[PDB]
Symmetry: D3
Subunit: 266 residues, 6 copies
């Protein structure tokens, strides 16, 4: 695994955005061979979406031949609701770039048949072949997507019951009232994520320090699903300073030595 | 993983039996497409075999098109011995249901060529395709089938030397004399079990509390092979009250919330 | 996993050599079906190379139809340098046995295109099909080959930055001057090793006691990559006495009972 | 120790307030033999202070012969600043009860000789003999008073540097401006607390879940100073529901049956 | 501490009995200066009591000037009930030796003022000065005496509520009827034990393997009160083979070489 | 405790030497009130002893009124043997300073009554009252003095059997011949050390990284006796860079900001 030890959220966003751009440009996507990008919501990717939109407007990237898939979506939350993941993605990213509406893939949290909806999302990924880069964040409790504690490490897209801890954390977006946070969500599985060619996790704040420790220095287990990355051949964690506080000095020293040139570019 | 927190062994048996019945009936097995059931011995499945036989006699299930495979068998123990797994299964299940003798698969602990016997058991599973539901229990030391501490997590059917701890526990069936308990057994591997479509483990008593903790809150490791379930896409653990004593309050709370409707049916 | 608890390095070498000979002879390699052997360097395999050369000269083994692959090699170290792994292997093994030069495979640490070199080494393994037996050792920090702490458990052959701890340990071969130890090395991946049919690790000295504990009694994790063996269907660890000091009494007792006949042959 | 498992912060303050009043009335303090009460600040004791005030108003307790000592005080913060502990205590407690000004002992965070201040505080306690009851809270990092991680378990009153985490936690009272929270604070030591006849710690909120687990199920260490309570002859922890989430099922079960009739008072 | 690694419970009782007799004879007790012996009940000390009796019969020891204090006694159980500790001690020890009735101190589990009973017991010990040797056993959950998990490490003699596990364990003596085992018991505290000049704990059986590991290799904590022995100046643990199974190899090796000539007596 | 994070062993000896001189000068010892210094041997204090010598030479300190006590001494090793602690201390320290022979207290490793020797040493310390400063090092296994793992935390000066690991470590001074290193040694106990007014431990090298982690972030236990420092009112650990590699990032950060201006002296 690669861990990029940066200082601030602004730097994290800039490194991630730049990595996404270079992968796409190096890929040279065509209409017959698009680049498939998996994306997350939440507060963590804000600086990355910001940087991505800038680079696009500056003419550095084109999303014309990029197909996107999101990690999850709230169940039973009106699609028009500003806090639905559909609204989040359009407001913060889609409405600003040249990506065709047919290239966008989002789960329908209001689908009448939940099993069918999840299964079809898997079929859609399969029709493209693979997700080339899946970007995400991590929960306080260590979840990747919404694969809460005790989620199978070989899981597929399906519905999951959100942990009280996750709902309290997400209530910050629902006027700080947990009763307004949806109780369920459709989410890609750990197995789904393990199938992506590259996984890039963004980690910000001391609130994520225990999750980062579990991922990097902990053992593989289903309580902290972020530990599944130890089993992925190409995972990267991009971190700010506060989030690395629980790591051993030797561990952080190793990554600093490794990524010195790859980050110190002002 | 799913964990069903029940109170007594009677409830555990009833939930498990009911789950087996609904899977079979939903499957609609034919002579050209049978339902393959993996089964265990020991004290744990007693209430489940009892409930299964009842439901059969009440006309709720038919084992006519069900093929069964057992987890293991003692090596060097006469097949006629009442404590052999062959005798256990006939006395407690086979002799009471409408399953054809040709649909029953048991390992021969007295086979002259042990490697050949184990290999052929694997071939037989393969000829059917897959085990749809493999039911089992857990050892005090955390073993699944007889995959004792330090058993490969990718293991196949083979012979294994029983741990002194396992023999002392099993001596309860041999007049409380460990010297009468067989030292070896042929057992399906962890990889064999991981290949089943669904795995259902029954957990009863405080004697199993540490094993349950390891499975649910511990990391993946070969010392407590029951932890392999964290890697299975469809595992369920059915527990009574005493067995959950080593779990964290938050963990048990999560499962109770999840399975409330799925268990509270009187 | 199998653990062979021996007393001295001389016994370890003799058991390992004998195991390699019996595998080859049982295989009956031909020019159209060679035996593929993966090999390590370092101080650990010294007694095994010694015993192998003896058995060859005594007419017990022939390496005529054996193809070999080494685990790694230093990057930027002149091939002629006595401490390069190319020199180590020729001096200690190749120059003494009847193995054809075309059957030898070593990584080129001075290759102009590192990615290409690593990729081609993988292709070469693939053209043979599989490595039948991969022999190795373990690092103080728990590494297998040079898959240092935080290496993916599904990794392939690639370049890796050596840990300060590994360089200090290896400086014993460079006049005890860490500044002379290369900083990088091309190494087979954990996934590469997991693909071998059988893996045999040699463990010598109390300096390796924590690594052995992690492998046998620890959980699967990428910090101690030797733990990947818990996931291999056919792994063996051959140990001397000092290296088992960190194991539990019950664990060592189990293996002693198991391997009693398999080792007590004077 | 005794752990009182309650549901709400309202029940916690009421249970703690009733306990203090019961101790005081049983002691029957007088001018020559006052009851010595140790007290804390922060958000946790609010409901306790309100309840004590209601009880004093109803005529149930008098503080005429109660001498108090506070745990700590910020260094360099002006005395009349609303966030100084001096201000907090008068506003939330002293202003509403009949306690004589001479009976109130607070640390002078702005004294010329900080070292003389600490020595004199310890002297003051000794002049009275012993603190009969010391009430306190617990930090997210497990500190008792401001004895931050790595504080001697035999420490006395002295100056202490606040951990970055505590300042972030306390910033709530400084307009979430960490820069405004004082970096230093005079505090009573762990030995000072262990010298008290009885220690009662109030635990509220999920954020204290790990600190509660460290105090109850962890080992004694100087990283989580709250663990010192395992060494005290008479320690009580009064908790609400969310703070108990990281404890084992059997732990909370034990305490629930012990305190059943002891908390039924509503 | 000293750990005496023996094989059998017969050797354990003989080693412990010889130790007591040696201490007593060396002390040379008299009416004005008696030897004070602290004693336990339960299944563990049986072989010790038998051996002590054989030694007294052979003329090797006299209890004429030995004062005894027992660790605990069940609350509410009638005195002449065969399972009361009073009954156990007379039947298994007092009835066969020359100890004066006035030298025997037992806890009155059926006293009117339970609190007065405990205070007076502590007073009795103080009147003699100090207990010279306190013998005890260890519970499966690590309790010393009946100082159940979460008992203060500075505790004194008091009333205590038995853990569900201890009652299950003790049900062996109550026809395996847990409902018959007393729920409460008066017991000496951890501080009471730490005040003794020397403490000797007998450990027998695999069931105590984890308690032994907690006492020897664990950290001091109030969950496994047996860990208090790390703080005692003169603590001895006498063990049989199965109780040592959870210790590390190097731990048991150290103790074996230290006590070699000290246990060769047969 | 205080942890002084320095880079080099040269800075460590200089910081420790300046600390001793400052304590001595502030104390202003005299014939009737000498300063009592506890001292160690081994490789760690070399730079400290050199620095103290340079300071005495420059006229900064006098040892005319300093009484010293050493931690331990090998049993059975001839006094004038260059590796005896008596020889080490005179050669490395006493020969170069103005300390009177009568002020020097060393353990007599070759005394007729070893037990009388230990009792008299403790008596000697008591006659002076208290050791004001005890300097020591830490073993790889965490021992303080020669209080090997499983040593009472309340122990006094006594004879002790060296662990195999310590003898291997100390063989460096005996031509790497473990057989030449004395198996026994008289040593001060943990209680003896805890009775000192201040304890300063010097930590140098990666080999002590785990011992440092056990002392700072671990729990108090008798396996790593260095952990006793968590219980001491005034303990200081002076470390070089490599010994800090196993600590968490936040731990070392806390200490760095606390001691910033306290180590800038060069
Ligand atoms: O010294 C004190 C209080 O005088 C602290 O230990 C607090 O008790 C603890 O930091 C909790 O703070 P709150 O969460 O209650 O605000
Ligand atoms: O208070 C006592 C004994 O008076 C207990 O700590 C027992 O020593 C322990 O429960 C062992 O019981 P047995 O296993 O020996 O019966
Ligand atoms: O009793 C002593 C010293 O008198 C020991 O605890 C050493 O301080 C420790 O073994 C370190 O040894 P070195 O690594 O410094 O040689
Ligand atoms: O699937 C989701 C996001 O759609 C994730 O697991 C979040 O990345 C994680 O919960 C963090 O959320 P933030 O802290 O970024 O808000
Ligand atoms: O839809 C999900 C089913 O997969 C459920 O409500 C179950 O609780 C599930 O079995 C647990 O999750 P995983 O093991 O699938 O993560
Ligand atoms: O393979 C076997 C059973 O054939 C198992 O691992 C048992 O389920 C386990 O050993 C528990 O046994 P009981 O406690 O149910 O008897
Ligand atoms: O037949 C089994 C062989 O697999 C053996 O006696 C070995 O001891 C085995 O190698 C260990 O078990 P696994 O790693 O296969 O579980
Ligand atoms: O890849 C390598 C060797 O080419 C290994 O991981 C070594 O086996 C290990 O580093 C031990 O080295 P020695 O202790 O045997 O020297
Ligand atoms: O060539 C290796 C790349 O694989 C690198 O320098 C990276 O640091 C790597 O991503 C880490 O290692 P693995 O996770 O691949 O072990
Ligand atoms: O005034 C306190 C000193 O007692 C200091 O700033 C030190 O940092 C102290 O040595 C650490 O704290 P304790 O070990 O005393 O908790
Ligand atoms: O009589 C005992 C009281 O000392 C009680 O029932 C309490 O439960 C006690 O506070 C807990 O035990 P210790 O902390 O005193 O062990
Ligand atoms: O002279 C010492 C005795 O105090 C001994 O050889 C013992 O082994 C001792 O009981 C253990 O050491 P401590 O528990 O006293 O450290």
């Amino acid at each position: 695994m690669r861990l990029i030890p940066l200082t601030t959220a602004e730097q994290v966003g800039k490194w991630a955005a730049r990595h996404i751009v270079n992968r796409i440009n190096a890929f040279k996507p065509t209409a017959d061979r698009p680049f498939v990008l998996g994306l997350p919501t939440g507060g963590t990717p804000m600086t990355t979406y910001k940087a991505l939109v800038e680079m696009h407007k500056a003419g550095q990237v084109s999303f014309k031949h990029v197909v996107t898939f999101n990690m999850d979506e709230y169940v039973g939350l009106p699609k028009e609701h500003p806090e639905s993941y559909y609204s989040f993605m359009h407001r913060n990213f889609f409405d600003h770039v040249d990506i065709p509406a047919e290239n966008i893939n989002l789960l329908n949290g209001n689908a009448p048949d939940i099993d069918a909806e999840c299964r079809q999302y898997e079929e859609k990924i399969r029709s493209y072949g693979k997700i080339h880069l899946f970007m995400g964040g991590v929960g306080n409790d260590g979840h990747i997507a919404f694969n809460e504690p005790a989620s199978s490490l070989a899981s597929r897209t399906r519905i999951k019951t959100l942990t009280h801890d996750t709902r309290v954390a997400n209530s910050r977006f629902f006027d700080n009232d947990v009763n307004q946070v949806p109780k369920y969500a459709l989410t890609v599985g750990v197995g789904t994520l393990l199938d992506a060619e590259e996984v890039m996790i963004l980690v910000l704040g001391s609130q994520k320090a225990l999750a980062l420790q579990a991922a990097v220095e902990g053992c593989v287990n289903h309580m902290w699903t972020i530990s599944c990355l130890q089993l992925h051949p190409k995972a990267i964690m991009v971190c700010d300073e506060p989030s690395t506080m629980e790591l051993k000095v030797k561990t952080l020293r190793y990554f600093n030595e490794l990524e010195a040139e790859n980050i110190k570019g002002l």
